[PDB]
Symmetry: D3
Subunit: 236 residues, 6 copies
């Protein structure tokens, strides 16, 4: 195998890859939006696919849950498979008082409670920062689709089942728009390989107000977000 | 769904659960060692199963890669599914000079470069410690099967593709026997719920000498380890 | 006085302020690029001015050297003077192998060795992140002026006379494009007040190769950068 | 002298040493439980003794209060005196809701607010972990003596007169069974020398309920603990 | 220019330099308390002067606000200008129950929330400590002038506009007498160059009780402090 | 007993106490320098004595080895026994290029690798600072005795048997004059109780050059140091 976690051969991934946490959602994206899709990985059930979107090569693959998991898959894609651009597509919570369930959030940089980025920069603050060309492609794609977007900071946590008091309130005070679990691990790996990464997420829950999206609202949100991402890949 | 990551109903999991990173390995364990095994989860491809081993209810499920991933699944198993004992079964590297490829390592406690345990104990050192009854059950099971074991410390890292200089040498000097990515997140969650956890791993690689197990040797080591874990479940 | 560090009255500052470290450079900017200019602050010699650029009111003020200094002035400008946008205009070093002396760098986010942002976010990683509208306005203004730009991360240090081994090589590995001393302190304050900030710098020195801009090159670069910033204010 | 802190000659200590904080308690142990006893150290009043228990050579020595103090004595015992096993015998508080005054606690691993173990492992989490053969010998000795035991985590603090809010409640939540001041410093030193260590303590106080052992209860529990430790040495 | 921040020639600064944050206060000191004063620096508006006090050469110069700013100027004064002694003269707040507005505080050592001193001593606690000859000269000069003094610890913060809860109360508990923003950065630089530094401040505000000196009181206490500092320079 | 570690009754200690690590040296000081000395404590062998020196009440007591040990005894002395001044008297190593074996070092402040002071000041830098009146009394007493002294910083380590690379060289660069194990824990406790503390040590070893005092030289150094300390108590 080309890597311990991927059975794809070199060349089996396009230079642009969408990634989501759930491998079954990766399969949904390939089936519904990729032309001439071909499954290229099934190791550990982490399905990945390669085909085209509007004539341009494009891949989609699951990355699992958490920074350690996306770090494995993204490091391999950039290093072994020579990927140039990864766009993470997912869902998030929000704490921001001006962000609402169903909003589309385009991430410019992400904080974290993980140690992985301090360990890369001699213990200092290393901002996990999206590539500007990627952010701009997502923003402009949404503008062309007449879909409004929130643009700003995410926060990537190691702990889904948080017990931490005061965190949500501090995140809200500094206008973090998205809370998820992976983006802060992706962007520094792109940096290391001279490559590009971004993230776009739809708000499923407001963590402060407790508003929540219905399953139908989540479907429409996903459809908006994935079309934004797909159209962005044509400009990248 | 009972949890955002598991389609099982309460009661679908036995009180004892073996967990490995790869859901396809969980299916192999259920197929080959569990009687009357039924699949109880498929969400995100993270296959879980429930059957019996020598008459006693037992489950097996994948937990994904990394502390954040196992934390989600273990928190849900203890909290929602009322599991009482989780034994992680997997592979590891070693840096210890007196430990060799194919050795079976039983983990008493695990260090980490993750922040998750400092955040549980006001920033202090919180040892991720296996339950003594679980450790002893594994040790005695291996004795009955005439399989030698190494017993001691593991180290759980967030970063599979380590670039850290000096780490391996310090781990070796203090006789850490296993390097993996999850056990340090499992043990404190078991503590939180007043439950039990342990870990057993087989050495696939020596990180210092660079010895490595042939695919046939890894099959033999896996069969040894899983028999130890399965027989231990009868005493727990 | 409206603040302990500023003699201006509320309203004396325009809603957009350009800031540089040297107050005499703020005077040079007012003298050479603003019409209708008046001095509005002289406290501590930290000269500030308000005039117009192509008809639109604009202010320019020194911020002194280091995160604590810019934090004082920016907190006051957003809170007391009701400023909406601050753009830092400065010089920097670079470590990036594809960035050269004379280059104009537009900052998307900034790392730091300061503690000020950990203290804002319960000790976690808080990325000091530029406002996307400001970044975009700078990028588009440079394109319209036919000036190439580098876009990416800065690193803000507390110590001008660094003695730290290994830092430059790590910054280079992750493609930090600018090394300066203030931007990481500015962006979180803008966040706190729900306001906007950005930073644009010209490269005076390559920290790795030791190339250094001549006096003539520094004048060329300054004239490019300040025109980019001034034209961007018209779109903000 | 063979060390700066010990007047004993190499060979004067048996390969197994019981250690307690108070040198006058080391003397009580020698006087009441060792035959053929000889005093082998008087330096700094830190009395140490060597004799026999049921025919087998055994030493007992004070270690003073705190991690720095036990670290000096244990480093010397392993390095200079070639000791193979140190068992700490002490008293502790408890926070655990199912542990009571009078209980005997056998320590599997120890947390701490000391920096000494982070400094051994490149700033990471290093669990101070008891040797499994020692833990098991103590557990089986107690079973053979018909004495129930609690087995689990300790917490070693640098500060006897704690002023820290919320600590006790977090220790209780994760079921720490013993609070004392030394074991977290002993176990990594044993690791460094490829040797063995353990700890057994009697509960003098419940930190949450404020129950406290009477002098009679402290005698009963001491008699239990020391007999467990002594009988365990015959198996080690 | 001899440094990037100073137009003075080597020799233009006397061996002893008084420094205050505001360059216009440096000018006031030179104009009203030095004889034969001449301006030796105007770069960045950071006025510096050299004259005499009672016939002995003495310089005074602004240092700007915050540890990064004073670090630049002090490093240059010791390294390039061969200054032997720097005395910071400033104002402060106090939290100490036994210190009041108007009091003159002589600093023996300074705490901080800056990272600059940990970075100098391998991450450990490095006390920013005033030189004993300087402290003693200030104490003895005040005694000869019949001016009472408080002698003790300062705290240097990076953040003028503090939002930190509990800090003032902890500083009060341990009898910190002065809160300011620079001295902790000065003392270690003096150590590095084998030179001398001290700090003397007047209390403008009581941070706990909210008492505040009137403008007249601030002038009277400034006059006391500057006379102490000037007379101390004759003993140094 | 009035404390868990001291059998003295309230009033049995004088307001001034000399403390050293070795209780047998406390007894030597009492026997050779105090008049009408009475032993007031022998709990844990930590001998303490009270008598007079040149007519003035004075006590001497051992404090054991390390910050946790001295913290217990000093906290009790200030809180229960109402002690006003503690002077630690001991030996040290040095790293400073202009400090030599046999030198007398008077400590103004102490660094540390302990966590105890960060935990007192919300994780910030808290300088362990000697009381200026105590420092001055020691300096002046040595002047009157014509004994040269070095005055400056100490470093208090938790680990006698250091394995840390680069520490000694950094301590030397910043002119730390004494390396020992206790003073950084003493000074903040004196602060807490509104009391006074200092430290004086003689250099037994040069850590860089490896020079070492002979036993006879250590005796003469001790005699010089203890006379300085005793004479200083008359001024306090």
């Amino acid at each position: 195998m080309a890597t311990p976690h991927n059975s794809a051969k070199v060349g089996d991934f396009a230079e642009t890859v969408l990634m989501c946490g759930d491998p079954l959602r990766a399969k949904l994206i390939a089936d519904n939006y990729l032309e001439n899709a071909k499954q290229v990985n099934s190791v550990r059930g982490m399905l990945g696919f390669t085909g085209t979107y509007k004539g341009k090569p494009l891949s989609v693959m699951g990355h699992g849950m958490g920074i350690p998991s996306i770090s494995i898959y993204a490091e391999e894609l950039y290093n072994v498979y020579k990927v140039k651009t990864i766009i993470r597509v997912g869902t998030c919570g929000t704490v921001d008082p001006n962000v609402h369930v169903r909003d589309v959030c385009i991430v410019t940089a992400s904080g974290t409670d993980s140690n992985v980025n301090r360990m890369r920069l001699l213990g200092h603050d290393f901002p996990a920062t999206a590539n500007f060309e990627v952010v701009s492609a997502l923003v402009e794609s949404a503008k062309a689709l007449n879909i409004p977007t929130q643009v700003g900071k995410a926060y990537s946590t190691d702990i889904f089942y948080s017990k931490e008091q005061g965190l949500n309130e501090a995140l809200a005070q500094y206008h973090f728009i998205a809370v998820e679990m992976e983006s802060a691990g992706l962007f520094p790996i792109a940096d290391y390989y001279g490559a590009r990464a971004g993230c776009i997420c739809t708000v499923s829950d407001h963590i402060i107000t407790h508003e929540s999206a219905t399953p139908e609202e989540r479907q429409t949100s996903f459809q908006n977000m994935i079309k934004i991402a797909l159209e962005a890949t044509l400009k990248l």
